[PDB]
Design a protein around this nucleic acid. Structure first.
Lengths: 108, 108, 110, 110
DNA sequence: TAAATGACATAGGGAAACTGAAAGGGAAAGTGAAAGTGGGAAATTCCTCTGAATAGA
DNA sequence: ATCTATTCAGAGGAATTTCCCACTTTCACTTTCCCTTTCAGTTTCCCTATGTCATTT
């Protein structure tokens, strides 16, 4: 059937399984996504969990079959979101030293 | 007593029990048909209500017994109307974002 | 007149060899190649979508002059048409190559 | 407004010779000089970082009508782009000269 | 007023990751023209049954 | 010498058969929706690499 990204993303947000990935508003319209830049030493694949989740979810990534590739999972997650109408990028807290991340918000 | 499509269609148009299926002429010579595209995430089953109604009506589709098949219902409905003389597709508003549909018309 | 069927038409283009880059890759004439340069590249230009364009002109999908040029769509339609077609398969994919980007299709059977 | 590609744009600046000490050295144009100096020195301005500034203005990254000129960043962006070009290698690093600071790239190719 | 030794404040710099805009791709869905189909209607053989015309008793 | 016992035309539906007519399905691509990839550059990250000030001999 293949998941559509917005409904899928919203579900992850509601379940709140991944960390650094949740609703940052009680009305539910703004949300955070970890985004530790790739070159940083403290950066593991645990910091690309949503990106990885999406890849596993769409069949792109299958642990065992393909080597894990972090940059691709991220560029893929990002491009999918950009084209999505009714959803804009708010603040770019990506290079932020302690808690690097981004908040997306649904608009009309 | 299998229904003939034009009389049947006109009846649905007059009863107006199907959202989006309605005349657009006081004179009743132009009607509109809901025409959302199958892939669209926003396509709920009822977006093929007339197509489904015709399939159930010709006894081709009995809920419970058959697996829903939305493409064929629309496909059958469109093909059935095409042979009909005195009837012609006037506008194709189906790749339309908000309210997608097609307008047929009766050539005198 | 009749509308051309894609495989016979393609074979004909291959035999005529009018388009540059489009050629049989073997004597048995069963494997052929199609130039497939990526659209965003700098050296890209309309002549790198010649077969795609030819097919569009051929099916009346495009009419130099009256209609407006949609190069990507020409490729999408040509690519999509072959994809369902039975008895033809994708063999190679050198489409992301630098100097000679192209894909290689092979004719098969059942 | 169409975005310029760096090599064709750079070659144009070299031919026009609008900046001081940019024109190629060899007439066949297989080598050229770049106002590559240093930033932690003394009289370093927008004159010694002209190509770097030209590229920044050219890509809209910076416009002498809003963006507050950052000479250090401009040098970083220009350096990275030249590095990735296959048929383009850096000959010598003559930035190691007092009064005459610069750099010599090659228009080689394989 | 000095060659040297230190002391910070950033400017390079090489890789590899990031990115926006737009082209590519998958594959499920759509299409008009063309050809196929089912089921009810019209038509073309089958079946008693009638019954007057023909044999046994 | 009637008195039944049969029997081959013509009836009046059955029993299929062949036709027709609306839709249905194929045919052979085309298009759409939603993301993915490519392009050709930008931007980090993480270290060095120097170029002005400030103490050693």
């Amino acid at each position: 059937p293949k998941p559509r990204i917005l409904p899928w993303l919203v579900s992850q947000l509601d379940l709140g399984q991944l960390e650094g990935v949740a609703w940052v508003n009680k009305s539910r319209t703004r949300f955070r996504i970890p985004w530790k830049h790739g070159l940083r030493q403290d950066a593991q694949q645990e910091d690309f969990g949503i990106f990885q989740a999406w890849a596993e979810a769409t069949g792109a990534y299958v642990p065992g079959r393909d080597k894990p590739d972090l940059p691709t999972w991220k560029r893929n997650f990002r491009s999918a979101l950009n084209r999505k109408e009714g959803l804009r990028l708010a603040e770019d807290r990506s290079k932020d030293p302690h808690d690097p991340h981004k908040i997306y918000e649904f608009v009309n």
